[PDB]
Symmetry: C3
Subunit: 517 residues, 3 copies
């Protein structure tokens, strides 16, 4: 049942003009600003908006605008100018707060906050405290947030309002945060699960660029991260902290671009509690230094990636120009696979402390630190299978090596060739090896050296035996262990365990005594 | 009963723009001389003047709205409520059906079906059967389809309307399908090519979570798949079937998240015909068990990934907590590279049956099943190059091993060290090897053991020879092959082939007979 | 319930025009001054004002529209028909030209140009000369640009208007360029930085499909590239040129699909200047030939990937059906990791010229060219660690090999087994090796051969020594180097350097002369 009432100017007029409504009552508002043409209906004690009476173009237009508005909350609705001059902080915060949501999964709640093309001046922290909120701009540079924050706070701070809980499915897409070299954090993420970030920039923040604490299961695709951090104050391009109760895990950085940061590009911090950061990945990422003119040059003395973490996957990443180690590792079972390293003052991969079961596989590069190596000789067992320029070791673990020994195929234990010298990583132990040459003088050779007394000192290799086309060539005596005569083959020289005499069993099988004078 | 159409210039344009008017269709004319602003309503086979505007701005608004509507078909245009209580099935289907399209490429046809923030109750199967239809929500949880289907049917069924053709360029983005633990399939994909899926969830489906039959060349990025399947009825989180004519191939799962499924996370089934599933990929994916408190615990007895397929790429994936093998392989040339495995009751990788030329490269992990190993000893040749905790073998293929033998670099054939034992995998063959130590007692050692007659049995390694700093030390006799005396260098001991006598050629080239008694 | 009558001018004209009003009759009065737009409904027995169109409210409603329009510039606003019949070239260019932007970063400017579902006939080159412009359609086939260009120009040309600068943050998403077999380039990219492309197709272009010159730091996800190029004219699916000033670098192709191209799928060209293409990546990409029925068949005689570049990452890619080498390399430190190769006429990976320090790791495949191998024997050092069908060598660099030697574990220098033959790669050097068997006749064997004189010739391996369970078995003499008597252990045979006599220190510690006659 529809019962048309006479129209009123505004919705505010409805209660005044009609203070005793009845069921089925239908009225149109006709002079209500941008709400004009809306039709309301008294239903179950409330006036309800209906799409039923669209005969008039203005009523149909209002219905269709309502539907079109469900795509996104446009920050322009809340008064942003986007001109880089007006302070847009309050309007952006209001547009975010207008989305009804809650914490954790919050299924069926949330949406997009859309930032059209522009420059948005932000002067205080903007907080996102509910699940399922995505901030989406017009493009990685078309939409730019320009910060004047100088108190160390983030421009965008994602964190649950109740920190015993979590925010799920938040993200940023297609926009830039520009710190303008002020002391602010670009983006702060805390207690987030299942975040989704795509093609966004964080640049020129003198605090952390992207700060991450106890974040789980979050994909970050196409991040552009430059000119962030402050080495002296321990601020970095991306800082990943475990926090005090759990950890950060399953952060996946895919096809990201880190360049010319003032701290490290990526800094893992697992000191917050015993649960260490784990199972984070960098796939196809670029780690590019600050000053290509020289090393050290103007490049900060900090690793491109500080990895205080376990089970990190560093897959086909590019490292260039670093006044430290490219990757400084403090943790276990990290995976460095198919990476290329070009020009650093330290190691490509520095396995520090008790780091163990890390793997360097399919990697290459050039120009590690002078007198150093692609990787160090670590305390515990780690594994490698790679071919770097200037490194003779090709595959090994702990102190067992398959290596190039001056053009020979070599199988060495506790020794390897570096430059012209043979290095003994464990100085309290001896060194032994086989090396297989392709010249007839060397043939297959056996080598050894005593314990030098000092880890990583050098040794002289003694050749013990050569096997060549014209002889078995012992350089030390042949020392027999006695055996029984019945065990011996025809034409066998042996010491008989029955009487400890040197004997020869000839071609007929007869045991004879070797005459000694 | 009104449907507003886009404005036209004049009355003469009505018949040419709208050749099939329906009852209640309504249109305004904008540039028609003195009749500008006239509004016509189609009723009783005729256009009837019903309204007339003076200011034509209303037509300008209608026109801009018409252009804005071209970006997507909003399901709310067809009466969906998104309140979680209204059955929205028919309205969603009507919105999908409103897009005119074709099969195969269907160039220039199709579009987006957009689901605003909300909960959508679906009570029967919704079918997408034309190309180029994408279902798109406001976010992985912000838009949520709640299924009440209990008969095994999918919530969303993608299948070509003609099964001799293909459905191309379909997908789902930014939404969740929630089976509410009912017997329904979350998403069914059949005979698809070039699908594109991004950041969508399939959860709590008691049938298959994602069912895939004969799908080609489809990218799935950021899928979140949990609590699906039914082990007792062979239903799984993702079920990949070849079907009866062809196969599923080039399914790329990138950065996906599988957790707490009641079946296998991923189950490949090539039993439909001779063309086996091939060339599918999992990159950076997570495979997380149901019950982290204990193993077996409440974890289903089923591999995290059952791989009845060939040339699968499992790249930098994470595997945790499985009451079976992590990866059960039935097929050839699968690649397991840079993966990490933690805690299962079977093998990390079980190469069953005739599986051959699979590779396990740069992996690590801990806590394979008691008494087992990271991988099994398979029938046919497979390849590995990884360093696992508790596994001495580092690189190998078939029964050829490079391994750690108690701190030594060891190159072994048909024997490896497991714990304190030496295992002979092929019992019909003897075992031989070299082990290179870093102590002077051992030096370079040669070892062997006779064929035991029992596969995988424990053998004793006999030391045959040590090459050390102070001697070449044979533990068996020196057995000469007779050679000619001209062939010998000075200072040579040899048996002469002329007379089968042990001789010595001294420092001057003189051959003398070793006196025997 | 409602019956719309013809409008009247004034309220007073209602009674005179319809003296016989029925229930539900509805009329608008249109020229009553202030009261124009009022709608009256005959209810019960009066005419009742029920609805009203306010001309002065439409301005406010327009503000909402203007906000909605900030999401994107829709080409339909500029007069596209999208029917494939009308030339849409000028309307699309006008739409793009209406974007307000500039060059380099151009922060806070730019936006999306949106192409709704349709077929867009384009007859001459469309240019994008300003930063931050993204071309977005409704789907990879739903929005299709149909080219009639035949003069070799591109359909879309992205290049800075000022070539002293760069174009930044441009892209294409969700649309197809269809060249209709005309002589046009699909998409041309030049002097671009930080491009972002997603799920777009380039097909049936008889010039290059995608031409790329001096492009930096650009992500390309889900590209579909088929039926492009023309081998007779040196046109290819994707052509990446360094240009004359710098190079192309950090191009990331992720989950891309290259199929049935008429040139090479990917052609790198570094001939423009000294700075070679570098650090480009292919992750999860498909490279599929033209004619699966036969090889050579109809397949173009050109590699699937021509790699004149350095530090390229080819990660877990799929290669199938090539009438040439699958990857023809001219460069250094490229990485071929986890790829699979099936059926080509040349090598899987052809390291040509001075190509050095490339890695082939974790790869497999079947059916390289008749009498060839998975990879060639290159001039300079390259590294491999993979298990291919029909290739005995498993790990190696230069001429140092770990291989399967007829079922033995073998460590060979300058020789490897190929079928029934042993090949000596460097003809001027000898060959030596160790092979470790699992049979009691062979045990651990030492093998060698003289230099053949001819590179890659067949040689015979001479067994020099067997170490078995029943003896140390020299096939050539034991040739002693003289040592001092005091250095000998008990039971030691040696030549004494004091007098060059063969002596034995027996079990009693006494040095005795071995009696000779």
């Amino acid at each position: 049942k529809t019962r048309w009432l006479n129209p009123v100017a505004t919705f505010a007029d409805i209660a005044t003009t009609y203070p005793n409504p009845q069921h089925g009552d239908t009225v149109m508002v006709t002079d209500d600003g941008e709400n004009s043409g809306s039709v309301y209906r008294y239903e179950n004690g409330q006036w309800n908006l209906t799409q039923k009476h669209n005969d008039l173009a203005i009523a149909d237009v209002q219905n269709k605008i309502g539907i079109l508005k469900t795509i996104a909350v446009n920050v322009k609705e809340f008064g942003t100018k986007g001109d880089g001059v007006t302070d847009d902080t309050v309007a952006i915060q209001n547009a975010i707060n207008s989305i009804v949501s809650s914490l954790n999964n919050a299924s069926g709640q949330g949406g997009i906050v859309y930032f059209p093309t522009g420059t948005y001046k932000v002067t205080s922290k903007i907080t996102i405290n509910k699940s399922n909120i995505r901030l989406v701009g017009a493009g990685m540079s078309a939409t730019c947030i320009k910060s004047t924050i100088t108190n160390g706070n983030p421009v965008f701070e994602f964190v649950p309002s109740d920190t015993a809980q979590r925010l799920c499915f938040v993200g940023i897409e297609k926009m830039c945060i520009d710190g303008q070299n002020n002391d602010c954090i670009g983006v702060s993420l805390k207690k987030i699960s299942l975040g989704r970030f795509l093609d966004f920039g964080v640049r020129y923040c003198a605090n952390h660029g992207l700060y991450i604490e106890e974040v789980w299961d979050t994909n970050i695709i196409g991040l552009y991260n430059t000119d962030n951090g402050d080495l002296a104050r321990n601020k970095h391009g991306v800082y990943i902290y475990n926090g005090t109760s759990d950890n950060s895990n399953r952060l996946l950085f895919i096809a990201c671009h880190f360049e010319a940061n003032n701290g490290s590009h990526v800094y893992f911090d697992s000191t917050g509690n015993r649960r260490r950061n784990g199972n984070n990945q960098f796939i196809g990422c670029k780690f590019h230094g600050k000053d290509p003119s020289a090393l050290p040059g103007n490049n900060p003395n900090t690793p491109h990636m500080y990895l205080d973490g376990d089970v990190t996957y560093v897959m086909n990443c590019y490292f260039y120009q670093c006044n430290n180690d490219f990757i400084k590792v403090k943790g276990d079972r990290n995976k460095i696979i198919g990476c290329d390293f070009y020009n650093c003052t330290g190691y490509f991969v520095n396995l520090t402390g008790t780091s163990m079961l890390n793997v360097i596989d399919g990697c290459s590069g050039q120009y590690f630190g002078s007198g150093l190596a692609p990787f160090n000789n670590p305390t515990n067992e780690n594994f490698f299978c790679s071919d770097f320029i200037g490194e003779n070791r090709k595959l090994g673990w702990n102190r067992s090596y398959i290596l190039d020994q001056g053009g020979r195929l070599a199988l060495f234990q506790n020794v390897y060739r570096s430059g012209a010298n043979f290095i003994q990583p464990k100085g309290t132990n001896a060194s032994f090896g086989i090396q297989i040459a392709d010249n007839t003088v060397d043939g297959v050779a056996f080598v050894g050296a005593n314990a030098s007394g000092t880890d990583n000192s050098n040794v002289t290799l003694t050749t013990l035996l050569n096997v060549t086309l014209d002889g078995i060539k012992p350089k030390v005596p042949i020392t027999f262990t006695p055996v029984t005569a019945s065990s011996t083959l025809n034409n066998s020289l042996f010491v008989d365990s029955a009487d400890n005499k040197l004997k020869f069993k000839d071609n007929t099988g007869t045991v004879k005594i070797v005459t000694l004078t």
